[PDB]
């Protein structure tokens, strides 16, 4: 009856009785009629002194009872926030769902524990998990009145669509960029570096997207961190077609980098004889010089496109 004694202590908080119970060979993995285990009971209760004995002694962070619930289930049910970092330091399951389909973030936004919140995102949370009554934890926190939390989840939401319309341009996934763009993914959104959707795809050669994008209201002339614009990235990757549209959609032909680089630089020096035409075709300055000096006919002497040179040259 060690294992009754050992539930009896961890749930009273006796810290020392814990240590005598386990020394004296308590399974620390007992469980009461219901599947509660000592840490389920010292997590419902708060006693983090217990909760670390525990999984030191072997305890299983992720043991279940009858319904499903984990001990992180329930440290996010009863607002312990210094227990659920030390269950998430031991390999917690941040996602484990129970009968329902309630995930500690389904508890934690529904009794609001704001703290709580930020720590289960930070630890890979689904915003969009849903449960067996397709509620989200954004749906339960403005069914209780939590309109904090509520607006924090919609903030991850958005910001975890952002990131999967960047990669979707990025791979030239058309479908889910689509799809994407009507959940109400931002075609403006921007990585670190400032690379937006259609950064991406006029670097990587997906036409398809760069069209997408332009009909969906993307910024033709945006500028990453350096000053690079779609324009910059589709002249020097040699995308011919993509060029086109992004001139025909408003692309400022002589936009400039930090270091005074125009597109028609970058397809001077790279070679790509084709796109150069164009850019002149549409205005591009062939006499703009860079912060260095270059012109793009230097540029092109220096890499050996003498045929791009010729053409610069007359131009000039």
Known sequence: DL?????????????????????????????????????????????????????????????????GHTPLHLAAYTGHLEIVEVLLKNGAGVNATDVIGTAPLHLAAMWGHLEIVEVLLKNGADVNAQDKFGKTPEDLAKDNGNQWIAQKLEEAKKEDLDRKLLEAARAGHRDEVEDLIKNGADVNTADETGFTPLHLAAWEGHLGIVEVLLKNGADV????????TPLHLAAYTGHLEIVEVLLKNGAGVNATDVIGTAPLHLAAMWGHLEIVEVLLKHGADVNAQDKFGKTPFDLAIDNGNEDIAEVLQKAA
């Open 3 to 67: 294992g009754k004694k050992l539930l009896e202590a961890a749930r009273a908080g006796q810290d020392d009785e814990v240590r005598i119970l386990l020394a004296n060979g308590a399974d620390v993995n007992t469980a009461d009629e219901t599947g509660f285990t000592p840490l389920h009971l010292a997590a419902w209760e708060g006693h983090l002194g217990i909760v670390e004995v525990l999984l030191k002694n072997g305890a299983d962070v992720n043991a279940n009872d009858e319904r």
């Open 221 to 228: 002339n945006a500028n990453d961190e350096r000053g690079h």
